């Protein structure tokens, strides 16, 4: 795609309306929203959706209720927003408790155990006492221990519609909701001779550690550039995540901008930056949305994001290369680092004209330099 495709919203047609869809937003063309839409009627006259994605899912119910929409992707949001669909820039767990008939929950399972948990409770507390919660999922991603789960929370539960793995349930709140858990983690790790404490909110990537490929791409961004290569320079973290490229590069003397499409990942990296004593832009962005059209960088450095097992590299991941080719001033360089057979090779070639491979091991670094 051109950075123009990526950043495009096209409406697509259902029976007497439209949804909006765009690359890199989820819940379209989905097994498990596409059952939820076959599946939710309204119940009672306040219902939310905290997974809604490009709003699939809970679309039959608009316009029979009222439907507030909690989403944490940026991408997502947009959508919904073009679709004239009300919907807040929130996590799951920060919905009003005790305010509402009926939750949607498209079970977020790619996102792990906590994040799920999270959401859950979240549903429980935000449902009035006899509300009901539409819960949909995977058998083959945890459906049944989350069903579980949300039966012990509520009450009642029954699956109210299969296709294959995929499943709704409907469950109703015979009982008080618990308390929310404990939400924040935080991990130390040193880097580069220095030492970082990260802060993060269930979901993010690589919970709990630095990842390999991120400090393999800090190690090769320091053995090329030496440790002051980086000092006044305006750099670009492609998909920050809760910033263990951002972090170091802002304690290595970087003016750092963040964009970070999950919004769980950009209040992690504002709390590390604040518990450094480091200052940059955490931005949440899709991409580079929240960028001014002119907006320029020295350094991009980038971990993109993979389908675990996959062999194709991802929409997302490809327009960050195309982002990275466009943000780089004259004589500007780019940073990548993926797992070793993902073809960014020719993608590289195509924007750049050339590229060098700094390492490869368990995970290769890619370097470009713009012309
Ligand atoms: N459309 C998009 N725009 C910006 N970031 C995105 C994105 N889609 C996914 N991402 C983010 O890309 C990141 C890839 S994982 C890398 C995280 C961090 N830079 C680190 O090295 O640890 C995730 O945090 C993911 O949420």
Redesign the pocket.
Known sequence: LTREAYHRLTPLPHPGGRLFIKP?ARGYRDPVHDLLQKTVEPFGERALDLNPGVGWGSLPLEGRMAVERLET???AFRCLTASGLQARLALPWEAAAGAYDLVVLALPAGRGTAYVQASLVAAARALRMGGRLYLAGDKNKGFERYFKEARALLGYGVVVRREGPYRVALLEKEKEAPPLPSLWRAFSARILGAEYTFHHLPG???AGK??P??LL?LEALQERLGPEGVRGRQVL??????????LPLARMGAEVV?????LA?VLSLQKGLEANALKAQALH???D?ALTEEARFDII?????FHVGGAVI?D?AQ??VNVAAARLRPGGVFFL?SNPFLKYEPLLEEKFGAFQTLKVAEYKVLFAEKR
């Open positions: 890199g992707s940026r991408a993010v990537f690589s630095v990842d490929a991120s791409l973290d492609l998909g920050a995540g809760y910033g263990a490229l951002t963040g964009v970070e499409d999950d990942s962005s899709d991409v949305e450095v980038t971990n993109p994001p991802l997302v327009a960050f680092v």
